[PDB]
Structures are given as structure tokens and as C-alpha cells.
Design a protein around this ligand. Structure first.
Ligand SMILES: [Mg+2]
Ligand SMILES: [Mg+2]
Ligand SMILES: [Mg+2]
Ligand SMILES: [Mg+2]
Ligand SMILES: [Mg+2]
Ligand SMILES: [Mg+2]
Ligand SMILES: [Mg+2]
Ligand SMILES: [Zn+2]
Ligand SMILES: [Zn+2]
Lengths: 385, 424
DNA sequence: CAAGCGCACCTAATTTCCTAAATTAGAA
DNA sequence: TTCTAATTTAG
RNA sequence: UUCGUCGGUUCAGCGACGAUAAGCCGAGAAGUGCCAAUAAAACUGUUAAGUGGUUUGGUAACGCUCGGUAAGGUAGCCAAAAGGCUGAAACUCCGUGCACAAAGACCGCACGGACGCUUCACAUGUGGAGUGUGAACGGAAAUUAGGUGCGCUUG
């Protein structure tokens, strides 16, 4: 429902960077003071204070802390200060049992404390020129008069890539702006705006035009890829190789000095057990992405990572579990699913695939999985020749 | 003029109690130790806040002799914690509280400034001990009995132990010589600890002793340089002899790569695993990685020991009395060393303390263009960076390994000032 | 794969520390 | 009555 | 000719052993989440209204909490019963003592020899020393910085 995205700050719109930085550092100092004093006031409120300290008219911890710290930290806006106090007292109340028991000393806050912003204090807008603008109301009433900074401090953010969709939804009206924060990173020496967007998620429904292509990789066991989304899932069969080495060496040892009958049962049972966990995971990734259909090669060894696995059992179990979950399964002929590119489509080292006609580079197993994920790949492969 | 070292001693069995009762005693005392540490830190932080408020209001700082009733926070913390921690012995509790209050006092400004958070102490805190509460006696039949004083008087009545809790420890190897020297009188025991090793489920007695190192006669005008080279892990060179000693890393990063690969592989298997790995908690879901808990660290600890002892022994063999090395602080030094993710700080610390034992002074110098300076001439030119592998001095026709030249330049006394005068 | 949030688990780098004198109390 | 472990705090 | 347990500590070998251990199971409710009821601090606005989301009890999916699970070898008799005697078993061999009846706890220690073996020395040998599989043996806590894994969200 509530998730956050980061937007780097380019420049203040109406103020030089020096005044903006001075204001931000002063407000960071006030925020850290508010957090520490609120933690100490919460300590006093709960009754943890020692005997000598005592040798309140409010209702909750937050009210008393906010009213006490309101005087000294007058530069911060009332809403931002209240959010900071709530953060402090909520961190104290969660760790309350540990502090009393003695499993934790005291909550502490760093020097580069992010500043807070309530929903009704951060406003974002676009421009005809395309420059994305955000408006922040940080200072209180006396602070604006003291610093001669009127209106709200307009800023310019970087809105590109996967962040443009979120911002477009925010400005369109679908998403809403929740409580946000200003974040400073010392290393990169840049500021950020943690705009938290509020939205109603939609329950995914299986669509037959969403495919989860599947291939047996040479580096991993199975690589799952989709063409509608760049999400990727892989089954790294490390335990399979560990068990293979264990069984081979045990058979070598027991050869020297009925005995191996137990080994034959253990190998067969482990394959069935492994084929159940793999099938459950494979289908459960089609459900999460809503892939209404699954495309997998139908089944020599072919130098797959599972050197001598029982592929037919895995395919049958995948088919059965997909039928249970309302997922159709297709069997695509794997002629050149690995050699063909996933973007250019030119059908021209082992681990990393290359597209000499386009320069695209990715994992070879992922490339083959994506090629399989393309609908009706058999026909376009035939026509490609 | 006195060093301090430690040695471990595995505890076999409780001499008079059973292993179950002894384990319960140890767990309860661990809980008391952790509680005391956290409470001492809490009281220190509260007193800091009260002092600041008092200075702001009344105009002057409050003297602890009036408000607290004790001179320092250690005394007040002992007077407070001892009621709820009546199972630890008085000396051990006082030592623990002093450790906590000394850690808070050392970094008080950083705590107020915000660079350092308030210290918090973990679950498996080692038990503390002092020299007055540890005594070791050896029987005629080759057994070492450690009479530990771990409990308080109220705890003695409740736990039904009317004397010092005694344990039997294995004292072999160099541990045998250390214990014999302690009993004879050469080594004086200091505050010690009890630690638990989860991998082997073994308790250890961590005796820390004080001793006078054997300081020989070594002139200060014989200097050995050390460079964490690009090809060889550590290259050693001298100015008076053309002697070169190398420590090429036959096995350095392979161990870390293997352990990290295995850990990542088994961690990613939590999504598709058996039915008994999910549904029982975080510790059980991450159970398979407990085999790789300390393989990377322990391998490097032994590897850094082997390198350091070899380095120190070479200094004695050539008769040196000074070891100059690099100042890697803030990663200002060369970013391309043969070791990739090694713990250079641990290697440097080991070299420092072993040299101090061997009566050798270690001096750190700031490196600037050290791999490019010509030892024979002194011309600071950057044109000899041939992959940081072969050094060819054009101005002198000198060809040699870059690591040897770097170590030789570090071996020149006051190399930092010489460089600063040469180019700045 | 990329970018955020939450949680915890691993490495390294850096620092401080590794009391003790005096008094009391219980057992011989 | 002597004495050796605990116990308390100064610095 | 893979992982792991024991053989004093770390790394490596060796001897025995165990492994589907990247496996199996149990209890419970501090958290994430789900179900139900209730709606505090604070802010803007006269007030009305809005933003904000607080407290309590349930269920039991969880990288939810607490946990349990395999791994070296060892000698019997006497008395009715307590106890007594003999002295087996782990990283070279022998002798003499001390200590050991079931062990999470015992398989060890000291002295004298042999046999290897690491240093040194004096003339391939000879003699001192350490040495018993090889190397090593200054750790603990905390903070800081980075990385990783899992879950969620967007592309
Ligand atoms: Mg997605
Ligand atoms: Mg014994
Ligand atoms: Mg055992
Ligand atoms: Mg070992
Ligand atoms: Mg025997
Ligand atoms: Mg001998
Ligand atoms: Mg050994
Ligand atoms: Zn292409
Ligand atoms: Zn030159």
C-alpha cells in the first residue's frame, strides 16, 4: 500500500545552494536534538529514571515530548517536528521491554538524520519544459521571517527511468503522496527526496498472454524468464551437485572392501524429492507473475547442468501442478533457443551470450529462457532459417 | 615496559558439580553480565543528560560527589546493578561495570556529536574475571585444576556451592609452557575471561598475563622495509644488503571465494527446500550456513600469523632494529595489491606486536609515489608504471621488480620527508 | 536485471582494555 | 584472635 | 579421491566414524501479515470539516520466538548388600612409577632409553639443544563502513 522511491535533488529553484545547505544542516541539527530529547523524555515518562533525578499534565508521551521540545526547536515546522517526535517515541515503545530487561542500552540517532515531511507539506508538479518540481514546507512561522525565505522552498528532482512511472501516477491523481523524507548521503555528497507513494494494489489475474518461458541451463538448473517483465528467476542446483559428489565418492569407497542397494534407493528418492520442490517453486513463480501459460522444451543429455536427471518426471510434475493452478503448458521444440538473440532476433563464451548483430549481452541461460518465452517461438525460428 | 598476551584453555569438566548445573550457572552469569553492561551504559547516558540539563539551568556542572553520592558513575552503577545482579561475584561485576562506564566515557563526545551510537551489548557476552579470583594448581598426576571464583555469597547458598568452583583444563602445547611460567612466577595473571565456542560447544578459560619481553641489542640504523606489493603479498628489502624475501600469496582469496559462493548458494536454496526448513524461525531457516561461520576469519587469522612471524624472524636474521611500513589509513595507499579483500590491518597489527616482543621498533610512513621513485637515483617519475610489475629507471638504466624497489624506498629512513622535499 | 523500504547476517577498519587499596565478614 | 575471600569505592 | 564429528586452540594431513544433514520434528505467541472492535497525540482550518492513524482481543502463513535431532575407542571378578581388586581404550616404539569400573566427565602425566626429524656447531661424520604429524599461537567488546540473503513495490 505504501512504498517509497528516491529522487536526487538537482538545485533549489529560487535560492542559491549555500543557503539551502545551511538551512538543511540547521534543520538536521534541530531534528537530531528533537529525537534525542524525545527519547530522554520517553525514558522519564515510563518511570525508568533513577531515584536521584526526582530528588505531568499531558496524556501520552508524544504530547509531552512535542510540547517540551517545541520551544527550542522552533525552526522546524510543527508537522515535521511532530513526525520526528512520533518516530522517537515509537522506537522507544517498541524496544521498551528490552530496555527494562537489560537487552539493549538506549536508542541512538546518527548525525545525518533525515528530515521529516507530512503529506500536506510536500507537493510535486511538472512544467511545460518538462522539469520536475517539488515544493517543501520545512520552516515554521518565525523561521521564515528570520531567514527572509518566503513561500515554500521549491526544488528540482531527477525523474527518469523506472521513477518516471511513479511520478506520473502521483501527478495524474492515481497515487497519493504520503509522509516523505529528505535524505543526505555523505559519500556521493547529494541529497534525495524519499517520496512515499500510497496506492491500492490490484490482485493479479492469470492472463493467457503472459508466459513464463523455461529452459534447462548449462550453468544453473532452470532459468525462468518473462518477456512482458524483466523479472528473472533461477534454480541454482548447488545441493544437486553436492549430493552427486557425495554419492559418487561413497560408491567409489564402498566398491573396495545389498551394500549399494541402499544407495540406489537413496538416489531415486532424492530425485523425486528434488523434483517436487523444483516443480512447486516453478509453478509458484508463474502464479506470482500471473503467467497463464508456460513454455518449456519437451524431452541425448545436451550438456545440461542436471547431467543425468530424470527430466520426464520433472516435466510431468510441472504439467500436473500447472493443471491444478489453471495454467496451460506448451512444449516448444528447442532447435536454437540458446543461439538466437532475444532482442535483435539474429540467429548467429558458453556462460555469457553475445549478439554480434546488436551487441546485447546477458547470461546465456537467461537469453535462452527469454527466447523460449516469446510466443510461438517455433514458427519464427523456422521462418528465421 | 610490559606487554600483555592471552591463551585459551579448554575446560573439560566441573570438578565437583555436574555439567548441567555448571551450564545453568554459566548461562545465568552470562545474562547477569549482559544486563550489567547494558544497565551501566544506560546509567552513564542518563547521567550525561542530567549533567547537561543541570549545567544549562543552574549555570554550573553538578559534582557527582553530591548528586549521585559516589565519585564516579562506576560506583553508582555498582550500587544500582548489584541488587538485580546478585549472582555475579563482586569483583567480576565491578570489572564489567567499569568496562561499560569506561567505554562510554572514552567516546562521550562522539556520542553527543552523533558519530557513534550508544554502545549496546550482545547476548553471548563473555564472563569477566580478575587476577584475585583465579588460581591454578597442578596435581601430582598431571592435572591442572583452575579454582574460579564466579559466584556471590547469596548465590553460593542458593546454588549449594560452599567453596570456589573448580574446573579441569587441558594444558598442552605452548599452553603448558605458559602455565608453568605463570606458576613459577615469571608471568603475572591479569583480568581474564570465560568464552564459549558455539561451533565446538566448548568453554575456554582466557587467561591474560603480563611479562617482560627479552630486549636484545639491535641498532636503530638497520632498517627493513615492507610493501604490500602488487604481485607478491609482502616484499621485504634492505638498504645495506641486497637480500630479498617474498611472501607470494599461494592461497589468499580462494578460501573467501569458496566460502562466499557456498554461503550464497545455500542461502538461495531456502526458497525451494524441504518442509522442515521453513516455519521454524530465522535461525532454523539459515541453519546450513552455520558451518561457514568462522572459516574465512580463522583462515586469515592463521595466515596473518604465519606471515607476521616470518617477517619478524627475517628482521632478526639480518640484524635489523627498525621495520618501516606503509600508512594505509583511509585507504590512501595503493589500491592495487595482490591481496584483494585481505585484512591488512590485522597483518600490520600482528607485525607491530611481534616486533615489539622481539625488541624491534615499527615506524609508519606516508607513501607517495613510492612504487615510482627510483631507489638508486631519487627521480620521482611516473613513467615506470609498467603494469606495476617491472620497474625500469630510464635516468639510470636500472631494471628490477617493482615490489623490491617499493620495499627499498620504504626502507630509506625519513622517506616521507625526502619525497616531500623532492617534489613539494 | 535496475532502484527504493523492512529485517538480519557477514567482512574489514579503528579504539580501548586487560584496577586496586581498604574494609568487612564468616570460618578456623 | 587470625586470617582469607568477598565487598565497596577512589582515582 | 564431497561435506561433517572426535583426536588441547586456528589452518593442513592422518586414523576411526556418520551423512538424502542444503534432511526431519515439537511447543508457543514478543513481531510482519490476515480477521474483528475501538479512534489518541499533532496540523490546517473560526466553529463545522478535513489530514493524520491510536488502543484491545483473535487466527497461526512467516528470514515469527524458543528449541530437539548422526557421527573415534574402552577390561571383568569377588560380597547377600556396601565396597574391594585388575588396569582397557586417541597422532612412533619400550621400561618404571603416579591416576583412573563407564564416562559430556576415562583413553593421561613425569622420568629414563631407542627410532626418526629441525636447528645450530667441530671436521661426508661427529656433538649439543629443542622435537614426537607440519606451520602457528594477543585476544575480548564496541562502534563505524561496505556487502550479502530474504520479503514487498515500481519498471
Ligand atoms: Mg514484479
Ligand atoms: Mg585427568
Ligand atoms: Mg566425545
Ligand atoms: Mg582439525
Ligand atoms: Mg593404560
Ligand atoms: Mg623422552
Ligand atoms: Mg598439533
Ligand atoms: Zn540481438
Ligand atoms: Zn634512477
Amino acid at each position: 500500500m505504501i512504498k517509497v522511491y528516491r529522487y536526487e535533488i538537482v538545485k533549489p529553484l529560487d535560492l542559491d545552494w549555500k543557503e539551502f545547505g545551511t538551512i538543511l544542516r540547521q534543520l538536521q541539527q534541530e531534528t537530531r536534538f528533537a529525537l534525542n530529547k524525545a527519547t530522554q523524555l520517553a525514558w522519564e515518562w515510563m518511570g525508568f529514571s533513577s531515584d536521584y533525578k526526582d530528588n505531568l499534565g499531558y496524556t501520552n508521551v508524544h504530547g509531552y515530548a512535542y510540547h517540551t521540545i517545541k520551544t527550542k526547536a522552533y525552526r522546524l515546522n510543527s508537522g515535521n517536528l511532530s513526525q520526528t517526535i512520533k518516530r522517537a517515541t515509537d522506537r522507544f515503545k517498541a524496544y521498551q521491554k528490552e530496555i527494562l530487561r537489560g537487552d539493549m542500552s538506549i536508542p541512538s540517532y546518527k548525525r545525518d538524520i533525515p528530515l521529516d515531511l507530512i503529506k500536506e507539506n510536500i507537493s510535486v508538479n511538472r512544467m511545460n519544459h518538462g522539469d520536475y518540481i517539488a515544493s517543501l514546507s520545512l520552516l515554521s512561522n518565525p523561521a521564515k521571517q528570520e531567514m527572509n525565505v518566503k513561500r515554500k522552498i521549491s526544488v528540482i528532482i531527477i525523474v527518469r527511468g523506472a521513477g518516471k512511472t511513479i511520478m506520473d501516477r502521483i501527478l495524474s491523481g492515481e497515487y497519493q503522496v504520503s509522509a516523505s523524507q529528505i535524505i543526505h548521503d555523505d559519500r556521493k555528497n547529494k541529497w534525495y527526496l524519499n517520496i512515499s507513494y500510497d496506492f491500492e494494489p490490484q490482485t493479479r489475474v492469470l492472463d493467457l498472454n503472459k508466459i513464463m518461458g523455461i529452459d534447462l541451463g548449462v550453468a544453473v538448473a532452470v532459468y525462468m524468464a518473462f518477456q512482458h517483465t524483466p523479472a528473472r528467476y533461477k534454480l541454482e542446483g548447488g545441493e544437486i551437485e553436492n549430493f552427486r559428489r557425495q554419492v559418487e565418492s561413497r560408491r567409489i569407497s564402498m566398491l573396495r572392501q545389498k551394500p549399494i542397494e541402499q544407495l540406489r534407493d537413496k538416489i531415486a528418492n532424492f530425485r523425486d524429492t528434488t523434483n517436487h520442490r523444483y516443480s512447486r517453486y516453478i509453478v509458484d513463480m508463474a502464479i506470482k507473475e500471473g503467467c497463464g501459460t508456460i513454455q518449456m522444451e519437451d524431452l541425448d543429455i545436451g550438456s545440461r547442468f542436471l547431467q543425468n536427471w530424470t527430466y520426464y518426471d520433472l516435466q510431468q510434475k510441472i504439467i500436473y501442478k500447472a493443471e491444478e493452478a489453471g495454467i496451460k503448458v506448451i512444449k516448444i521444440d528447442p532447435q536454437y533457443t540458446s543461439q538466437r538473440c532475444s532482442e535483435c532476433g539474429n540467429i548467429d563464451g558458453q556462460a555469457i551470450f553475445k549478439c554480434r548483430a546488436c551487441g546485447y549481452e546477458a547470461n546465456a541461460d537467461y537469453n535462452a529462457a527469454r527466447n523460449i518465452a516469446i510466443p510461438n517461438i517455433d514458427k519464427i525460428i523456422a521462418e528465421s532459417i
